[PDB]
Design a protein around this ligand. Sequence first.
Ligand SMILES: CCOC(=O)[C@@H](F)[C@H](O)c1ccc(Br)cn1
Ligand SMILES: CCOC(=O)[C@@H](F)[C@H](O)c1ccc(Br)cn1
Ligand SMILES: CCOC(=O)[C@@H](F)[C@H](O)c1ccc(Br)cn1
Lengths: 412, 412
Amino acid sequence: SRRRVVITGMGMLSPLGLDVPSSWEGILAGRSGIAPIEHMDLSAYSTRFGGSVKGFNVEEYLSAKEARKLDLFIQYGLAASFQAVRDSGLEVTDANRERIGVSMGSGIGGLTNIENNCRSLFEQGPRRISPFFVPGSIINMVSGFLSIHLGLQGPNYALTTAQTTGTHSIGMAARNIAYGEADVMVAGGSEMAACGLGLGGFGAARALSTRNDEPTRASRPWDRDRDGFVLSDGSGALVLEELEHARARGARIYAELVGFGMSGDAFHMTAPPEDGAGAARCMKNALRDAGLDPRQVDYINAHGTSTPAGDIAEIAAVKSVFGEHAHALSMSSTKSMTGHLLGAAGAVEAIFSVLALRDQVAPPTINLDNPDEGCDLDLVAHEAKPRKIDVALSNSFGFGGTNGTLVFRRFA
Amino acid sequence: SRRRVVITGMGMLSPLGLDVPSSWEGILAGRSGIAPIEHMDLSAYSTRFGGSVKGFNVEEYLSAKEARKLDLFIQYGLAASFQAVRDSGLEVTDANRERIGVSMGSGIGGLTNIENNCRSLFEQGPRRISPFFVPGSIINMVSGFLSIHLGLQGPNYALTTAQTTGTHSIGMAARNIAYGEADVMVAGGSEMAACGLGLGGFGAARALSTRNDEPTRASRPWDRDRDGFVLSDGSGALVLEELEHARARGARIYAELVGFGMSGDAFHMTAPPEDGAGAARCMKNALRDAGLDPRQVDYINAHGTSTPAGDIAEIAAVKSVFGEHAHALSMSSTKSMTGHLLGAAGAVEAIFSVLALRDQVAPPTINLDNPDEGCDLDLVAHEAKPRKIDVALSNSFGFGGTNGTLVFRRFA
Ligand SMILES: CCOC(=O)[C@@H](F)[C@H](O)c1ccc(Br)cn1
Ligand SMILES: CCOC(=O)[C@@H](F)[C@H](O)c1ccc(Br)cn1
Ligand SMILES: CCOC(=O)[C@@H](F)[C@H](O)c1ccc(Br)cn1
């Protein structure tokens, strides 16, 4: 048997806002968080825009001294984590601190720090590398710093599964609770890859939209004029909690996490199979995990990256899993507004999936002016769609063919 | 109910050898793999030696076409994974490919590739970044590329928990199998952090031994003259398999994985607590998970990094967990010979713990000339100790205060 897992707190930094309610308001209004990247000479780059976090104030969370030791992706992860723990109302005590752990991940981790220390190393040699370079840049330091700050002694780890990180982090944290290794977990991911090496790295692979003239129209999942994903920064964190533990302290429960699927495509390093066979196995695994018939799904938060191949693979995957129900659910890509937060994508999209359940509304796929060949599902083009949502799926597909699916349900 | 997990295949690159048996021969003979680094000019650096893999031929495993795209840490991880799979005798089929996954992790990932692409960006501009920079550097692409080459469609992920990565990767993969999420997992880790950024970064923290004039004597866990860890490269991979699945196919079983513990110190970003309280919590979690009396433990493969604070914290933890039995078990640090493979340390040390069970011998702690104050356990100083070993424990403790413990026992 297995314990039940609920969501009792959420926290976020995104291109749409510095917390969950500001981000969610932007999502339901179809606002874009995408703009030209400031304070950076991107003249020589084929992409000059992305989803930046605007006006982040790290001194709301950390002292100047502790902030200087930490890459922006760690700052962002800690901001989301502190928000989520505050939102949960949980009180850490000597009686429960061994039962509270952390799994906050990242796809690409501390590129900004690596860039700045490369500069020191190439220009002045190794003796000008910062002493906090390593501990301030390693992906497991959101989990590490959070556990030190709050006194959490539970399972402490970090996933790095590229664009799937945030989905896997949440799913595995939910397993830890379900199988009794923890009663509470803070889970999610963070990313700040808008450095030269990030825009340059994805640019070299020609994976990014180059729609420099109209950045807000660049991210257009399933639209015939899409030309690659939009690179975005931020973080998402959820407080996952065993149901009886949540009920005993009178926690506000947002939703239940009922299903988690994983699969490998075993197909290509960066491209999904055209038929989305891997994504289809992963969704089927997640529904089996939840004991749910495909017909019970109302809402899918797609991976929906705005790549030619990825977007069409997900349509094929959903038609395959859902058959005669594939048109009755609503599926949307909030990446149309946020861009692609890479390892934080799954974290912020799990939060959007929980809020779709709370507010009974499917967020829009903006910029979906001209659906592509066979993109004839209900993709919630342009504007939010109030509807019945009992069950919401959130999908992530990443480099290496690594897939994850979360299944959330309304809690009563 | 929870299924039993056994080890049916192992694979390794280390400073001592290009496979498991050559590395193990070195371990039992007390040989050092530590030597001045040849692959770059380190005259500006305070540490100029480490544990290199010597004479690695990637063309034993991969086409030159594919090898050229991958960071050394990925090449090392694939080599160890291929060795492990071949050693297992397992055949991948349409009937079992959905039930075989991979969890190969890294602490730092493709730092050589990142540094080289940073150099291109700064000297020549973004148009000179490799198109393969991201998929060839990102930590999850051991798991990704292995799944693509062998057709593994089961759970596909990667951990990054700094110096605990290999132990956590093996533990969590064992839980996948235990809980029914897979029947087989390839799990471990790989590392190649020996570039200017890595030696410079750890140097800037003053975490490394600076014994440049006697590199084979540098790694001296629990010795009064120790002065930090020795940086080393390589990979370990194990094929973990559900017991009845192994029995059904007539697999050779090396040993059974009976216990896994995790804990967070919640103390400091880099330093362990002097009393080893988190390490003690982690070992107790693992022994209770294994259903053991602590007196059943015969051998501990320590973390034993050759840091002043780390080594003595481990003695304090072991004395706290095992009481008077702490004087009866044998505990050694193979890092005395291999140095510290960071995210691959737990993976190679899990293999050495399994071979300790197969061959009924405690590997030595070489260089243990003058044991420090209170380091008065059986630390297997200088020479391998043949002895009865039914139960072997492998510990790892990392930045962020993140702890892991694996418990292995003989299988009859
Ligand atoms: C291209 C992907 O790169 C990364 O993920 C890096 F962030 C990597 O994990 C790393 C390098 C150096 C140090 Br210090 C810590 N972590
Ligand atoms: C302080 C944590 O205490 C516990 O009892 C367990 F959580 C245990 O450490 C553990 C955690 C996660 C996984 Br996977 C496996 N084992
Ligand atoms: C008996 C052989 O060893 C000695 O005589 C001493 F040198 C002692 O072993 C020592 C101390 C510090 C370091 Br570094 C290395 N060796």
